[PDB]
């Protein structure tokens, strides 16, 4: 029954074509977030949902099909759930000082230098991450770690990347 | 003369931390794109300056120095110029036929396949790539090829990295 409502929940939202474009992915998280006052957000923008779909598009079709939307939103879910309960001051962002415990209670163990680096690269001027913007990194975070296991054939640690796979890996997300 | 026209440009823009930050960037940008109406834009946003500062930012300040925005802002003017000039049709917007001459312009060839991606991930539907998006995506790209020029100076055309380097170099939205 769980199986069955979320089939159909994907074809409402992809529409005719049967797959979820970044503007359809906009639209529905944006209506998602307007049901939870506890997430802070200036939305998600055009940009940040093309660079997800590009991300996710493993088929490259430039949309999301059913496995890949289903990845993504359940990954969405579960990362909302882990903002909510790092958010320990309910001001709807996760600060400089949650950010650690929340990426490590989805499964990102990083270090001083790495988390310092997000909070730069992600935050806002006062160390402050909102929920676009925390679903945005963990996407591509997540989908950077898949890529450097998909790399690491022989199991060692150190990955060869060539220039034109390097191109494809950066550019389309 | 001019050396010192844009070193005050410089300060004046940078104000009182001496450094340019996404905001500041994102807020001349705008003017700019506002006094060339036949640069069409949805405009620049925050996600897209925070974005473009922070691959520009050499010395993790966070905001852009001197010689960071120097190397930034003449980029911008010289891709200004190739988009005016490659859009042969006049629609304000760079068109996938149009978009292989004006990256060869700016120094940049890559195969069909690569276009293909860098289409799906900055055009929309039609194949038309706006201006924001065009400066966003050079912006990417010339940054790309330049950190793994730096680990490539042998010019194997390969790189070879752990799972911290690769966050490092990856984690860009
Ligand atoms: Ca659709
Ligand atoms: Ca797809
Ligand atoms: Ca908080
Ligand atoms: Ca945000
Ligand atoms: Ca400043
Ligand atoms: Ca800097
Ligand atoms: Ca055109
Ligand atoms: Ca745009």
């Given at each position: 029954?769980?199986?069955?409502?979320?089939?159909?929940?994907?074809?409402?939202?992809?529409?005719?074509?049967?797959?979820?474009?970044?503007?359809?992915?906009?639209?529905?998280?944006?209506?998602?977030?307007?049901?939870?006052?506890?997430?802070?957000?200036?939305?998600?923008?055009?940009?940040?949902?093309?660079?997800?779909?590009?991300?996710?598009?493993?088929?490259?079709?430039?949309?999301?099909?059913?496995?890949?939307?289903?990845?993504?939103?359940?990954?969405?879910?579960?990362?909302?759930?882990?903002?909510?309960?790092?958010?320990?001051?309910?001001?709807?962002?996760?600060?400089?000082?949650?950010?650690?415990?929340?990426?490590?209670?989805?499964?990102?163990?990083?270090?001083?230098?790495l988390?310092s680096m997000i909070?730069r690269?992600?935050?806002?001027?006062?160390?402050?991450?909102?929920?676009?913007?925390?679903?945005?990194?963990?996407?591509?975070?997540?989908?950077?770690?898949?890529?450097?296991?998909?790399?690491?054939?022989?199991?060692?640690?150190?990955?060869?990347?060539?220039?034109?796979?390097?191109?494809?890996?950066?550019?389309?997300?």
């Amino acid at each position: 029954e769980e199986v069955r409502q979320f089939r159909r929940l994907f074809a409402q939202l992809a529409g005719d074509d049967m797959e979820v474009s970044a503007t359809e992915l906009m639209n529905i998280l944006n209506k998602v977030v307007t049901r939870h006052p506890d997430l802070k957000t200036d939305g998600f923008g055009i940009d940040t949902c093309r660079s997800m779909v590009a991300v996710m598009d493993s088929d490259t079709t430039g949309k999301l099909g059913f496995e890949e939307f289903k990845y993504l939103w359940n990954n969405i879910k579960k990362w909302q759930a882990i903002y909510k309960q790092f958010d320990v001051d309910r001001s709807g962002t996760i600060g400089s000082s949650e950010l650690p415990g929340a990426f490590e209670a989805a499964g990102f163990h990083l270090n001083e230098h790495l988390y310092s680096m997000i909070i730069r690269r992600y935050s806002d001027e006062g160390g402050n991450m909102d929920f676009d913007n925390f679903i945005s990194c963990l996407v591509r975070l997540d989908a950077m770690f898949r890529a450097f296991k998909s790399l690491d054939k022989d199991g060692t640690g150190q990955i060869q990347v060539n220039i034109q796979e390097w191109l494809q890996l950066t550019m389309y997300s």
